[PDB]
Amino acid sequence: RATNAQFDSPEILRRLDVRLLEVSPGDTGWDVFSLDYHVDGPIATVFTRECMSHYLRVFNF
Amino acid sequence: KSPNVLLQNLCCRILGRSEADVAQQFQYAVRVIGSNFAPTVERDEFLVAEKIKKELIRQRREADAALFSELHRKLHSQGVLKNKWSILYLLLSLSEDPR
């Protein structure tokens, strides 16, 4: 709401949703945050769940 | 046996003492283990394996993270452990960071 992001198309906004990594003793909060683009449609064959893991690594670096 | 006296064995194994020398620690064991015998949280061995690899990358023992890829396979190869999840969560819970 506060930044310009609210005005964009509802598809890429809705598929932008948050995720986190699973809790364990001694973790760091900066590592556990991530953003996940999630796919439910036919577009899976170009953005599949094994490519999402590569993306998580990229976003972390 | 029974699990209550088997927990007394654990209390003889961590400490270096007899069971008539200390009765306090076994009372802490029976107070925490008691009125709970069944996990009320998520059950999957696959997720806790993906939480052990994620932890070994965070400690930069990333060659040991490819060792766990073989040790979990060996654990499947014997196949005589009823819950593989409970001991993996237990061993994950006591993890130290020496870096």
Add this chain to the structure above:
Amino acid sequence: AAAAAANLNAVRETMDVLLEISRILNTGLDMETLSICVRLCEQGINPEALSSVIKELRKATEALK
């Protein structure tokens, strides 16, 4: 028998491979304790409950020292 001791071989193996998993996560459990820890898990038990006991018993061997 003979195969009834081969199952005893397959349990000592379980116990050793979980000790390799025990050292790479750097827990304090040794082999003898780990043989209690696998026995408890066959009946089914909360690791969330056992970890606090082990993390207290390792904090009560130098405080009862």
